[model samples]
Structures are given as C-alpha cells and as structure tokens.
Target: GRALRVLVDMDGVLADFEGGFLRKFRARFPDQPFIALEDRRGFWVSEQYGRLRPGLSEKAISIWESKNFFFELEPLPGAVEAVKEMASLQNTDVFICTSPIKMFKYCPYEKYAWVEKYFGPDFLEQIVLTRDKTVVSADLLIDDRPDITGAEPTPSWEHVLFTACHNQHLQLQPPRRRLHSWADDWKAILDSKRP
Candidate 1:
C-alpha cells in the first residue's frame, strides 16, 4: 500500500557511463588498449586508462568536470519511463549510490543538476548521492555492482542487480537479489517481498 524507497546507482543503472567512457577513451587514445582491474583496496580502476594519458590528462579531467560525460551518456534503454512508473506505483525515493567518489569531483553540482536535467527537479526530492549505500536503510537497491551487494548484509536490504556489460561475469549468488532491467519491469520486483 505504501511507496517503496528505491536506492539507485548512477553509473550503470541510469547512465551508460562505462560505454561512454570507453568510447571516448578509444577516440582520444586509439592506440591504448583498456582493461579493468580491482585493486586491493577494492576500488575498480581501468588498468589501461587508469591515469590520464600524456598531455591529455588535464584535458580529460576537464571534460569530466565540464559534465561532458553526461552528454556522451545514453540512458539504459527504458530508464526514463521506468523511473516515472515506479514513482507513481509506490512512495518511491531514489538515491544514487555510487563507487569511486572521485567521479563526482569535477561536476560537484552535476549530481543535483543532472537529476533535474534528466529526471526533473521534482524527482530531486527522491534522490540521494553517496558512495556508501550499504550503511543507508532502504526498501530496495538497484545497482550494477556485485561488490556493493556482496558487502551488504542480507537482512539489511534487497538488491536488484542491473545487468551491466562489464559485470556480466558476476553471478547472482544467493543472499542478494537480481534484476536484469529496472528500466522495464520493476513492478515484478517491487511486488515481491522476498528481501
């Protein structure tokens, strides 16, 4: 009867960040091959383009700060409509839970601005931006990373694994939930009370 509090992730859930980043990387550094690796600290970094390339580092950093990354991003297929529908169905509040806090450094205001630009200002009331979402309490979390879900306790939250191309290797093991696409069929997930 009540609305659901949905905790969402930004990079993979709403925006095709990796896809856009890789494309831009290839365009800028065509000769460099890219690889992703997880460091001992549990941070995911691109082995190939982890550090900015010579002479282009400053420019690349500037582009991210200018919100150029937003322009290059395409929404995950049905994200727009799905978010709207979910809001109408439940008392939904959407917060962005992301890793690599550095990504937001350039566009400090971009978080709020981007949500309004894409999902509208009214939806702003429903969003939260944080790197540590596991500490927050929510009815459900829609994210693309397995590490986030794995780190969370089962009793604490229910997870919806957004299928990202880079994370395809992650199997949806037990104690965590899975959803191939939140942009399309969130109702099926919302209706279930398993978590």
Candidate 2:
C-alpha cells in the first residue's frame, strides 16, 4: 500500500501566531483596549484590533513583517504532540508546505528554526518552502487559513480546514472539510490509516 502524503501548515495551524502577536501587541500598548477571540472580525485581527482601539494603527501588518513575530511564537495547545504523532505515523509521510515572507527577509529563517526546534531532526528533509500551497502535491493538506493563496483548486488534494479563530467565519469551499481541532481530526486520519 502506498503511504498517504500529508501536507501540513506552520504558523497559525501549529504555532500560536495570533496569540503571540496579540501578547506582544498588548505588552507594547498597555492602555489600549483588548480584543478577545470570537470578537475578532477579520482574517488579520490585528487590523481590526487597531480600529477598535486608538494608538494601534497598522499594528498587525507591522508586527507580522517584523523579525520578532516568527521567532517568538509558541506552539498552540497540543500542536507539538499532534505534529510529532503525525510525523511518526507509519502509513503517512508528513511534510510542511508553508508560505514564505519574501519582503520579510528574516521570516523564512525564523520559521525554519522554529520547526527544527519544535519538530526535531525528522523534519530536516520534510519541509516544502513554497509561495503557493495549492500547487503542492499531497493526498491531504491541513492548513489554518481556509482561503490562503493556492489553497484551493479541488483536484490537487483533500483540504482540511484547521480551525482557528481567524478563519472561523471564512466561507470555505466544501464545508465538510472543516475540522474543530487536530485532537478530533488526527484520530479520524489515524483511524482511516488502520484496517
């Protein structure tokens, strides 16, 4: 039997990108108003936060473009263990297909370091650095952003929407692809891998 090819995303799916950014944003502006999850109304919630509070203009884009954002992210709950388990699955070959920040020169390096630090040596040959994830070939793709560039085009692979607050309201094509969490879907994937 052929091993299923699974392509995973970094950033929001595995790493707590929004959480990290929000923490730093709040730290930098103590007096500014805070925007709780679920209350955020856009894909880039920082922009929404900026609008809700004074003195926080363009904070999301600015912070994302900075070197600190990538390097400082923490793994989301169960993210590390989930990824490790997926990577260890005997019938599946796990690979990362994440976007690179061309304008942010330090971002790519920081992302690579973050993966290595958390995922360990097994991922040395498992990353697919590409601008377009849709073009990457895999039996399945798990990503946080439902509408990320090249994440569609149905013939490519089965897309699993990794649930994140930013993408909760996104009108994803094929709505059944939505997954509440890796805790729920990983079992489904592993179960299908069995007899």
Candidate 3:
C-alpha cells in the first residue's frame, strides 16, 4: 500500500496565494501601483513590491501577514480534484506539507482550517507542518519553490517543481518533473514514478 508517498505544498501549489494577496492588496489600496500576476518575478511578493515603490513592500506584506489570509485562500484550478485523485490511487499516500509564517499567531491555525474547508476532515490528519521540508520523507514533493533546503543535507523526495510565474525561468533536470497545471495529464505523470 506504500508504493509512493506524495507530499504537496499548500501555498502557490494547492492555493492561489498570489492571486488572493494581489486582490486584497489592490482592494485595500486602490491607488497603489501593483504588478500583474504574469509579470511576477520572484518567490517573495514582498521583494517585488519593494521594487515597485519605497515602503510598498511593507504595505503589501500587511495583507498576507495579518489576519485571515491563509484561511481565505482560494484553491488553485483543478488542485482539489488532482489531490483527491492522487489520494484515491492504489498504493499511494498523499499529504499536505507546508510551513507557517513568522507571525505564528493565526497562520498555523488557519492552514488547518483551510484544509478542512476544501478537503474535509479526513485530509486534515494528513497535513505535515514543518519549516524544514528536508526532514519529511516522501517519494515526490509537489512544490512551487525553485529550491528548498533545511537542516537535512538531502531530502528523500524529488522536488517536482509546480509551475508558477516566479519559478518559470529555472531549467528542470532529467528525472525532475514540472506540473504546469492540474488540468495536464498528471495521472500519467504520476504513473511514470511507480516502482
């Protein structure tokens, strides 16, 4: 039953974090200049906001770092179906692996709440919250980050780069996989990993 262990990240992977943040940012400060979703460059939106204007970074960060940001995040297109499909597959286990922000007040609680909201109570037990993803042992990790490093020298899972505007520039190596969208032929892609 343990043929494959798949770990998926929450932010930017399952959830439309960028879109939500941008919407909140613009709604709060309509006059403020902002970057379009396509034009986003780096992983950290704060970095990009800082480049747009002085003090804009802190202003933009306030929306996400404050209350209810994680709880209210909308699911990425096809993410719920894809994750459920992976979970239902024979001999495979699925888990959501995500880290909490430094705020530590509401982010952690909201992450669990968000999972339950979309995926129900059963999926809630499958979450693995860790700052160091390297400590988690899995066959594949579907995440948007270009690079992930933690206390462990080498993580067991292969980081399948989930496509996002920020990580589009990086070249993927052989054996490494990229999930352009949940609408893609992801089942076949996962089947190729079967041992």
Candidate 4:
C-alpha cells in the first residue's frame, strides 16, 4: 500500500492554542467584556489589543519556551491518539502546518521548541511552519480557518475543518468537510488516498 501524506494544522487540530488563549484572556481581564468579531480584520485593531486581559502577553511568551507547554496543552480530544496512530502506520507521514502570529516572529526558536516538545522531537520532520500552508503539497490538509480553505480551488487536497470554540460565528460553506472532533472516526480520512 502506498503511504498517505497527511498535513495537519497545529492550533485547533492538535494543541488547544485558542482555548488556552481565551482562558488566559479571561483570567487576566475577568471584568472585561469581549466579543468574538466576525470580521477577521478586527484582530488587528489597537482597541482589541488594549482590551487583551493582563498577563496574557507574558504568560504566552513564557509558554512558548516551556517544553511542557506542548505536552501539557489540552489535546483536541482525539488528537493525541490520532497522531500516534498516524505515526504508527507505515504509509503515513503526518505534518503539522501552522502559522505563527505576527507578534511571535522573534521567537521562532521557542516556537520550534514548543512544537518539538508537544509533537515529539520528530516534529521537525513532521512539521512545516509557514504563514501560507497552501503552498505545501499533501494528500490532505486539516485546518480550522475558512479563509485559507476558501481562497484556493484545489480539489486534490482534502480540506478537513477542525471544529473549535472560536470562529464558529463565521458562516462556512457546505461540502466544506468538517471533522467535529479529532478523536472521531479518522481512519476513513487517514486511509483516504484520492490524490
């Protein structure tokens, strides 16, 4: 059997980055009221920046360097076992494709270390860090962002939307395949080699 090349997104698919961010956000600004903006552009506003809960900046910075950060990160339910199973399979090469936030440009080393810690040392071999993941070639790509998936028209790559707490407000197009939980039935997806 031919090996299946799978490209998985890191944030929502593996580590609960958004979850941790929100939790930390609330912890810092317990009294602050925050709303999930439908327009992705709102993330760039200064008001939004000012509204960020306290300690979030420092805590996030520290977490990037901690080895346990990745390991301790809450896996998206079935992510751990799903990744392990993918690794165990002879024909599978799971790659973690993620985009680093602009603020963390100076901390690539820390980001790499965090990835290595969480996904294992083999992460370098399995992970590809880049702002634009659509450039990479793979049999399938699992991501939570709609913009990326909707931007291109590549029928060859299976795009699996990893459901998350955030980004639920944005209406997603149908036939846009959804993987509710990473722990959910993944054999069908991993085994799929249509490309």
Candidate 5:
C-alpha cells in the first residue's frame, strides 16, 4: 500500500503556541489587558493584542522571540499521543511541517530542541521547516492557519484546518475539512484521507 504522508503543523496544531504566549504575557504584564483564549479571532495574535494597546503587538512578539520560548512551549493536549498513533499506523508517515519566524535567532534551534524533547530524539528526522508549506508534498497538512499559500499555487496536500481559538469561528469551504480534537477526531480524519 502506498504510504499516506501526513504533514502536521507545529504552532497551533501540535504545540500550544497561543496558550503558552498568553500564559507568559499575563504573568509578565499583569496590568495589561489580554485576549481570553475564546475571544481570539484571526491568525495573528499580535494583531489582536495590538488592538488592546498599540505597544502590545511588540510585547507579544517579545515573548515568543525570547530565548527558550519555543523550547518551553507545552504540547497541545493529546497531540503527542496522536502523533505517535499516526506514526505507528501502517503505511502512514507523519512529518512536523513548521515555519520559523524571520528573527532566526533562537527559533530554528529551539524548534528542533522542542521536537526532540516532546516527541523524542528519533522523531527529529520527521521535521520539515519551511515558510512555504505548498512546496511540501503530502496527503494532508493539518494546520490552524485558514489560508496557507506559497510559491506553489496548487499544493499537493489537502489543508485540514486544525481547530484553534484563532480559526474555529471561520466558515471555510471548497475543502472544508477540519480536525477539532486530536483524541476525539484525529483517527476519523486520518482514516478518511488518501495518499
């Protein structure tokens, strides 16, 4: 059987990026207004934060840009187990397709470290770091970003919208597939896809 190549996103899909940011941001600036997780809207958290205060965007960026930021991010609930299950499945190959910010200081390094820490050293080979996901070939790409586009206009993979505070409220179509929960819905979603 031909392998079903799955491309899982790092930030919102696997790592609880937004959640971690909110935690640190709140602790650091207790007096600053913050967007509750449920109140989150678009893909860019910085933009939302900026709306609360002009300086907030930079403040939010600082948290993610700081050393050990990516390394310390908590994995999304059930994400590690789900990835393991996907890996163990016969004829299915899972790859962590992540994008590093332009800063490129600690992001690239910590991303690898984060992967090794959470998914084990052996899983390191599964990473595919690139800003443009369209170049990657896969049966499915599970990501929280509603719009994923790059050099390739027509990507080989189907974009499965992984539900997060940012994208859950969106009404998307054409390929409206969504994965809301790793434990509850990942298997069902994966089973329905073809290479």
Candidate 6:
C-alpha cells in the first residue's frame, strides 16, 4: 500500500467554477468587457485593465464573491467517480480542502450545502473550509490554482494540477505534478499509487 494523504480542491479542479462564473458575469453585464478564458493564465485580475477584463471590474468581482456563484456549479465530468475511487484507495486518507473566500459570508454555507448535495453525506467529513490551503497537511494536494503568486513558506504536499482553462499553461517545478484532463488525470493518479 501507499502512505499518501490526498487533499482535493472543490472549485476549478472538481467543479467547473470559472466558466460558469464568467458566463453569468458577461451575460448579466453585456456592456462590460469580460475576460476571456484563455487570458486568465497571466493574472486572475484583468490582464489588461478595464471593466471588460475579468478581475478589474468591481461588478465581476462582486459576482464571483456572491453566494449565487457557487450555487449551481456543475462538477467536472468524471470527477465524482474519480474522487470516490481515490477515497477507496488503500493507505490513503482522502480529504476535501476548499478555500472559502473571505467577506463572502454566504459562500461557505452555500459551498457546504453544495458538497452535501453532490458528493453525499460521508464526503462532509472530508470537507475542510479554509482560506489558506497550504496550512493543511497532506502528502498530495490536487488543485487547479497554479498562480498562487504570493504564498509564503509554500506547502508541504505535492500538487497535482487539475488542469482547467485558466491554469492550463502553468509550468511546475519538481515533486509538484500535472494532469491534463479528468480521465487521463485519473489514470495517472491511479498509476502512481499502484504497485
């Protein structure tokens, strides 16, 4: 068996977070220049500053921070099954560690409910709501937010990049790993743990 404790992220990794958020943001405010999916690799905020850009707009930020943003996020295809398999792996402790946005009072509650609704009851025990993911200890961290530009001391676990539209272009050093798509990612994960 293995000795890895895997921590999975909720947003971009499992649930298709940004795409849904962007669609709503742009549709609601058609006049504003919404940031495109491809341009998010440089900065979460507007790569080019303006109302139309993704991060710069107060309205877009507000939408992202709202409870409604997390309400209907559809999980990425094959994610739930993959996670279930991961949880069942021998000698592995599976935990769901999600970063809750500060100042978004309802976001955490909504997220908790969302997890319950989708991943079932047992996964609740797996849930950890934190703003700083690096604080948590694990052998592996599967997350999509590669542009953690200013986290100090760094984290202890190896990160398996759950490639999304935003972080697809990211480059990793060593120990930290990469996965291109869900099924392929799942296969890679399984392969690593197998004897």
| Per-candidate local distance difference test | 0.63, 0.75, 0.90, 0.64, 0.90, 0.73
Worst 10 residues of 2 by lDDT: 186-195
- Which residue pairs of candidate 2 clash? none
Cα lDDT for residue 32, candidate 6 = 71
Candidate 6: tens digits of C-alpha lDDT, residues 121-155: 77889898887777787767788877442254677
lDDT of 5 by residue, 1-195 (tens): 899999999999889999899999999889899999999998999999988898999999999989988999999889998898889999999999999987899999999999998889999999999999999999899999999999999998888898999887888986578888686677777778854
**Between candidates 2 and 4, which one is better according to lDDT?**
2
Off by over 4 Å in 6: 1-3, 43-56, 147-154, 190-195
lDDT of 3 by residue, 79-186 (tens): 999899899988989999999887788999999999999999989889999999999998889999987899989888878889998888778778677988888787
The CA lDDT at 166 in model 4 is 50
Could you say which candidate leads in TM-score? Answer: 5
Model 4 residue pairs with clashes: 3-91
Model 1 misplacement above 4 A: 35-45, 48-67, 103-105, 149-155
Tens-place lDDT digits, model 1, residues 25-138: 667657765433231111243422435355444444444544566645777778777777777764565566654447565444655666788888787776665557777787
- Total clashing pairs for each candidate: 3, 0, 0, 1, 0, 1
- By TM-score rank, best first, the candidates go 5, 3, 2, 6, 1, 4
Q: For residue 37, what is the lDDT in candidate 6?
A: 80
Instruction: Quote model 1's TM-score.
Output: 0.75
Q: Rank candidates, lDDT, best first.
A: 5, 3, 2, 6, 4, 1
What TM-score against the true fold does each predicted structure earn?
A: 0.75, 0.84, 0.95, 0.72, 0.96, 0.84
Scored against the true structure, residue 56 in model 3 reaches a CA lDDT of 97
Task: Evaluate model 2: give its TM-score.
Answer: 0.84
Model 4 scores worst on lDDT over the 10 consecutive residues at 37-46
Better of 5 and 6 by lDDT: 5
Candidate 2: where are CA atoms >4 Å away?
Answer: 50-57, 149-152, 169-175, 190-195
